[PDB]
Amino acid sequence: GKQALETVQRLLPVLCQAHGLTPQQVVAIASHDGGKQALETVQRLLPVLCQAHGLTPEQVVAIASHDGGKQALETVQALLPVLCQAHGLTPEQVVAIASNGGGKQALETVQRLLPVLCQAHGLTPQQVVAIASNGGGKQALETVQRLLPVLCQAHGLTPQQVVAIASNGGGKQALETVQRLLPVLCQAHGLTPQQVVAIASNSGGKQALETVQRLLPVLCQAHGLTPQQVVAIASNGGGKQALETVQRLLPVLCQAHGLTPQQVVAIASHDGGKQALETVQRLLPVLCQAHGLTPEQVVAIASNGGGKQALETVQRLLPVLCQAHGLTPEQVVAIASHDGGKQALETVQRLLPVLCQAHGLTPQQVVAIASNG
Template sequence: MSTEQVVAIASHNGGKQALEAVKAQLLDLRGAPYALSTAQVVAIASNGGGKQALEGIGEQLLKLRTAPYGLSTEQVVAIASHDGGKQALEAVGAQLVALRAAPYALSTEQVVAIASNKGGKQALEAVKAQLLELRGAPYALSTAQVVAIASHDGGKQALEAVGTQLVALRAAPYALSTEQVVAIASHDGGKQALEAVGAQLVALRAAPYALSTEQVVAIASSHGGKQALEAVRALFPDLRAAPYALSTAQLVSIASNPGGKQALEAVRALFRELRAAPYALSTEQVVAIASNHGGKQALEAVRALFRGLRAAPYGLSTAQVVTIASSNGGKQALEAVWALLPVLRATPYDLNTAQVVAIASHDGGKPALEAVWAKLPVLRGVPYALSTAQVVAIACISGQQALEAIEAHMPTLRQAPHSLSPERVAAIACIGGRSAVEAVRQGLPVKAIRRIRREKAPVAGPPPASLGPTPQELVAVLHFFRAHQQPRQAFVDALAAFQTTRPALLRLLSSVGVTEIEALGGTIPDATERWQRLLGRLGFRPATGAAAPSPDSLQGFAQSLERTLGSPGMAGQSACSPHRKRPAETAIAPRSIRRRPNNAGQPSEPWPDQLAWLQRRKRTARSHIRADSAASVPANLHLGTRAQFTPDRLRAEPGPIMQAHTSPASVSFGSHVAFEPGLPDPGTPTPADLASFEAEPFGVGPLDFHLDWLLQILEA
């Protein structure tokens, strides 16, 4: 065990007893029949009551892995790895079967999600007691909404608060929607956040604050939402006035993250210092750093490390330092760059500075850098045979867990019956991260899906291999977007770099789980989110929080496809399905957005509604690095084999492939994306947008060729 692991175990109530329990039980729990890893044992022990949780694992693991429970080892560990883990395990053993049956009808994954928090036992009991009532009038919550509320620390109290306050908050003068109330309640401290909204919403909508209801909800819908609302009310007048002169939108941006109160206080304390020499940051840069989970710590890290990182041997620009700091975990990412940049630029790694910055400039930047440091020499050797550029792209797009999954599963995927090339494995990791790699390894039923598609909706045309991009091209496109310093300029730049048309590039990005709005804004979601969307389009949607489908669930999915898609009328329904457009009701009034610095450190012009979208997704895509850092992206890359050259203009040709190229000189590089006539400004992807994106998974439409191409990439 490492020193850090020992300290983690000891740093909780009952730490002494937990250390003694680890010493006594670690060897047994690592052996048969438990087969836990050291990291799993440490995770269980590193909580209040760790000793009791380890005892609970010894007593319950074998039982919970067998019928009628059927939990995986990972699920049992997740339940046990919280304060009160032993009690949560016992509650799952007592209630899982009942909660899966009528009238509750929860999935195993939903029960695990509820139990895998501090107070999981009490949350399960609350769901059993209140689910039926909350699904009925006047609440009319869905099962998924009840589960979302309960699946956090303090889930029991949050459910009780929803039962008490939902009806009142939906009425005047609050006029919140059910979805807004659920969003506020679905976080640690949800009960307190609901109470704070009830107490402060009316005041915050009036002068001098003049916040919109949506802005108040955004602030409250994070861990520590109550404290963030109180901080906004206390600090708003000061931060709006000189010398800060922050806009209302900027204040909301800072407050709408976990730790928003602390971030606002840090801005007030550090703003003037960071605006002056030697930092000389712009207001927008300070706001960008503060507008993340851990914004306070990121600002403090910039103050501490800025001068060192700007000097030799690092030589980072101000924009690069800001880019690294402007993600969730920015402090840790800066510290990792400080520790690893000289090492990663030297032999045997030989990365350039831009590559290191690109990896560090996303949520989870520190573990991604550490994974590259630990695994790059291994992954370049036999049997992996990945290039440096491929490893960097995977780390930048999908992060640490994808690299770990490749190290664990690629030797098997390279052999029969999978026989995948390194390029295909890299593409799979970039499509869906660890979850996609594990799903392919476990047996995603691609053949069944493709056979049913052929039987129910035959379409004449060339095979998908001749239509879609190669795995290398797919990785290059995703890496280009994730390594671009100005996200909203990334789409236009990609048109020139890859010499393709807008419809073709949109289709390519859609085939890997990116909506049109996200593509045009350059905000590529993380691999986990995109993979969940793609599974939905393929007709399989595991519960939120499941890392990857289990072999049993995949087998059940294949059987359900046979039953569902084999029913009469499915072919006709699919064949006549029209191409779905974004519903008219998804148009949203523009709101203020968080501005992000451009290459010169100056604010870029905002996109309507972009702030709210980024806040709701918790900044899952933090892409700031310069496009020229993607040295592995070949110029004039032709995506697809049927190409037509159009030298004078971008031609929006229909069809399932990237059919046209354009000269880079013909592309406008102005400060705004040059939308074609009739295309509205992109707003935020709403639930209706995403539902439309995932609807009719087996229908015949413009995306069918690319869905076939995706299935071919995933088929092992």
């Protein structure tokens, strides 16, 4: 406490000078139970681990920066060489296992269960690394060991599926939630195991599956959409929120913008679907009123990866493109309406005035070229 502060005064200067730490990195380390010893340990181990296994000081800091920093660093030192050699791990992988807290125990557990899990269930070191590399990897590994056989017999899940469920924030929780909710989602709600797996396989599988559980009957009966569609929405990162915003925005968009739920689904069914859907609400009126677009075209634009950014740049570029190069909004829409329409519109802006001046190409020709994958 008082000694943790004195030690920071003592070591801050030399750790920043001699190893390139920042005061912030130093504070991150001191700001845990037993910050004094944590700091002293970084000081004496950092050069060693850098020289013996090529750990950057950034990697060392990331290990020290959680409760039990001293114990986790010591354990990396004792175990990195053997883990790397015995199971083919990179130092990088060993650093990921250690840098979430309960580092010491996470590494030791990986040491214990790795050959086991790999032989019993046909797992890969890389898979057991992934399962261990988030907050709760020790618990997560035991739960995989425990539930792996349960889920693969009861519900026909594969190890790859189990691994995918256990490898994000909260592996233990996600696995147990799949175990509890799988039968229910399928038999009461008309899902398949594969779909339950897809929803679960993301940062926040637990809440995602829970949100799906509650919004499924509402969204299906009220807006006529199917489970396949609900799963498609929920099966991307940020799925829960995506579904949640579909529920509040579907009605508004359908009634006020004459969108159909089929389209709303398409918008939401990609990464950034939540922000894409949101952006559609914000920009659709301006696009229709000032830039010559129909809601239908607005949908087509939003209905790809990064629809939000694509709409935003259609709004940005359409005026220039029409005024200065004689494009129609139709033409703009045709360019923006493909995977990477955004950058495709950006390069159309760049090249148009140079191609239609040296090769008398017509704007129509450029458009024809740019309107593809």
